[PDB]
Amino acid sequence: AASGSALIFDEEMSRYKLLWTDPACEIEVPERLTVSYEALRTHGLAQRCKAVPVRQATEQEILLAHSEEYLEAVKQTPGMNVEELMAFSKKYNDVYFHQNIYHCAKLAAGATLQLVDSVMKREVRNGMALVRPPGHHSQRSAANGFCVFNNVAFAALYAKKNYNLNRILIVDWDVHHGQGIQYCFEEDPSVLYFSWHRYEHQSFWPNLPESDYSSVGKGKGSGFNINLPWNKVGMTNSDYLAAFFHVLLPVAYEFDPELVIVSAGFDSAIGDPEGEMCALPEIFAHLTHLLMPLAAGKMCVVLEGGYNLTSLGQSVCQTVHSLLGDPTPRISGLGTACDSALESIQNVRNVQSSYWSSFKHLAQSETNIVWPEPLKRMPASVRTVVVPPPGVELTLPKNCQHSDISESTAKEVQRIRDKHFHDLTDQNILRSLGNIISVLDRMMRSDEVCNGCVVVSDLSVSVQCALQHALTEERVLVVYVGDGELPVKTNDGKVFLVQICTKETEDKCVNRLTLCLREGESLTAGFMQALLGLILPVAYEFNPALVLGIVEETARLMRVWGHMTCLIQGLARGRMLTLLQGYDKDLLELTVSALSGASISPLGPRAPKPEDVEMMEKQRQRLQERWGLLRCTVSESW
């Protein structure tokens, strides 16, 4: 029932700055805040967000993650002159103090709590806070790396105390390691901390041995801290997506968090002087999108780093775009991760194998400066178009609408009939072909309609008209559940077929991925592992212009179809056409709700069957040489 996105911001947090020459801190400027908000204003995103006000974090809230001694010392900084502020700043590592920074730090902390309360009270579905100073380096008794108070650490502890949450996920995609968060939740299994960061074999700041992949936590919390070190610069979109598909997402979806907090540092984007990575700002549209199915969309994005003012503004807009549900931009040129990234991904999965089900099979040997401006992202006039069987009135959300075959469209169905289906005059089945062409014409030719769902009776004729009409326009991904062959040719390079069936069928084709999941209670955990580890990696590298989902009537499927429909909307700008054979009121309502951008119910509780993981890893061995994004280990060299 929650809707809308909160944008917490206040220009007061830009009224402190570095007052002496210091090459280590010159990049942390107030302009990072003003450029970010002005970019959101230019693209119309701020106007679409609920402007929740900023407040000061109280002393009792600061003491949640900081000591009385450190709070008392920072509290005296407003009364210090420039000379005394230099003496206080050199007691810490790479951080400056201003006479207004204590005031702003309480605002940056209070802003994060305002976002947490807005999300947990269902007043908004998600939100982002544009705060300054950052926080993820701050520790219990020390300022560190431009950070005074650990804003994200506050949010997790705040949501624990005031809402009795048992599982909170923190995703730190800033290019630096948020060691302040790791120290805070080292022994806490209730707060899962994931962080990738420029490491370069401990040669990069903050040069900490505990920033490596071997630090998995301590005590009752071991396995709930996940560090992914980047040992070379220049990491690309393929490296970031490999990290998500093969490390973060498989852990996050079986952890099943009740709230997702993001340490959103954009110094991991291209052009940044600190990160020196090569990921485009568009990648953050998908990093946000792939996490939104978690915790029923309850996602609190908190700003951290980001120092290229041009790259910062573009990356912020791509994040808020996805938070508002706007379509995701297509990502081209995706392939395998580099050797250094595959090594880091390899080592993390190995050390985490003793803690998570998705990596359990790895433990035993019997099992195993200038870049182009991003395109304009615009939400469709109506997002989803539904056509139920004739005479079936349904209650649709405000994002949806029924079909009204035009005269030009009706002439198209006639010439198609008088060529391939000469003997076919069963009225309703013929009229379903008119709806398919009507929806597809509205999806591809204009930004009026994004996706749609069509209920059909005869499959082979319906899927043939759908696919052949979309091809005669570039590339279609087909995800079909059910058995038997379909009128789909995968000989050229225009179609990729994902089939989930019950009877095992040898593929012998590189453009086909057949998943034979054995019927059982663990079918939910098996499908989720194949979705994150196989289906999504090939779909993102394939980069289709349209997704065609097909569900035969003789469809277990109910629990996972919503998650697939949401996640798969990261492909093809969200343009997905779903063909459901037969009428299932529950399946159609679940399909339309996910297509319309609504939040999906969590899966909650596990571990899949070893025969399924064995089948899935055989699929990866057969396809990873063509689709490199499937690789999660370093390739063997001749």
Ligand X SMILES: CC(O)(O)CCCCCNCCCN
Point out the residues that are catalytic: 137
If one asks whether residue 224 binds K ion (CB under 5 A), the answer comes out as: yes
> Shortest Cβ distance from residue 361 to ligand X (Å)?
35
| Selected range binding Zn ion among 102-110, 165-173, 297-305, 508-516, rule: CB under 5 A | 297-305
If one asks whether residue 265 binds Zn ion (CB under 5 A), the answer comes out as: yes
**Which of 28, 61, 117, 174 is close enough to bind K ion by CB under 5 A?**
174
In the stretch 163-182, what mask flags binding to Zn ion with x, by CB under 5 A?
-----------xxx------
Q: Which is nearer to K ion, 150 or 225 (CB)?
A: 225
Is 94 annotated as ligand-binding?
A: yes
Is 355 annotated as ligand-binding?
A: no
Q: Which is nearer to ligand X, 188 or 304 (CB)?
A: 304
**Binding partner of 469, given K ion, Zn ion, ligand X, none, CB within 5-8 angstroms per partner class:** none
Q: What does the binding site for ligand X look like in residue numbers (CB under 6 A)? A: 23-24, 94, 134, 136-137, 145-146, 174, 176, 205, 265, 267, 304-305
Q: What are phi and psi of 397, to 5 degrees?
A: -65, 170
Q: In three state form, how does the secondary structure of 242-308 look?
A: HHHHHHHHHHHHHHCCCCEEEEECCCCECCCCCCCCCECCCHHHHHHHCCCCHHHHCEEEEECCCCC
User: Which one, of 305, 271, 307, 266, lies nearest residue 287 by Cα?
Assistant: 266
Is 492 annotated as ligand-binding?
A: no
**Binding partner of 620, given Zn ion, K ion, ligand X, none, CB within 5-8 angstroms per partner class:** none
> Shortest Cβ distance from residue 95 to ligand X (Å)?
8
Distance in angstroms (rounded) separating the CA atoms of residues 188 and 486:
50
DSSP state of 220: G
Is 253 annotated as ligand-binding?
A: no
> Shortest Cβ distance from residue 28 to ligand X (Å)?
7
Distance in angstroms (rounded) separating the CA atoms of residues 245 and 237:
12
Distance in angstroms (rounded) separating the CA atoms of residues 579 and 146:
52
If one asks whether residue 229 binds K ion (CB under 5 A), the answer comes out as: no
> Shortest Cβ distance from residue 304 to ligand X (Å)?
4
**Binding partner of 70, given Zn ion, ligand X, K ion, none, CB within 5-8 angstroms per partner class:** none
Is 307 annotated as ligand-binding?
A: yes
Q: What are phi and psi of 264, to 5 degrees?
A: -90, 85
**Binding partner of 145, given ligand X, K ion, Zn ion, none, CB within 5-8 angstroms per partner class:** ligand X
CB-CB neighbours of 327 under 10 Å: 24
Distance in angstroms (rounded) separating the CA atoms of residues 574 and 588:
18
If one asks whether residue 149 binds K ion (CB under 5 A), the answer comes out as: no
**Binding partner of 224, given K ion, Zn ion, ligand X, none, CB within 5-8 angstroms per partner class:** K ion
If one asks whether residue 10 binds K ion (CB under 5 A), the answer comes out as: no
Is 339 annotated as ligand-binding?
A: no
**Binding partner of 198, given Zn ion, ligand X, K ion, none, CB within 5-8 angstroms per partner class:** none
- Vertex 360: Cα angle to 355 and 362 (nearest 5): 120
Question: What residues contact residue 218 under an 8 Å CB cut-off, 6+ apart?
Answer: 186, 187
Q: What are phi and psi of 186, to 5 degrees?
A: -60, -45
Q: Which is nearer to ligand X, 134 or 452 (CB)?
A: 134
Q: Buried b / exposed e across 263-274, counting CB within 10 Å, b at 16+?
A: bbbbbbbbbbeb
**Which of 185, 230, 266, 627 is close enough to bind K ion by CB under 5 A?**
185
Question: What residues contact residue 169 under an 8 Å CB cut-off, 6+ apart?
Answer: 192, 194, 252, 255, 257, 259, 260, 261, 294, 295
User: Collapsing DSSP states into helix, strand and coil, what is residue 495?
Assistant: strand
- Vertex 66: Cα angle to 63 and 68 (nearest 5): 70
Mark the binding-site residues for substrate, compressed into ranges: 22, 94, 307
Mark the binding-site residues for Zn(2+), compressed into ranges: 174, 176, 267
- List residues binding K ion (CB under 5 A): 172, 174, 185, 193, 195, 197, 221, 224-225
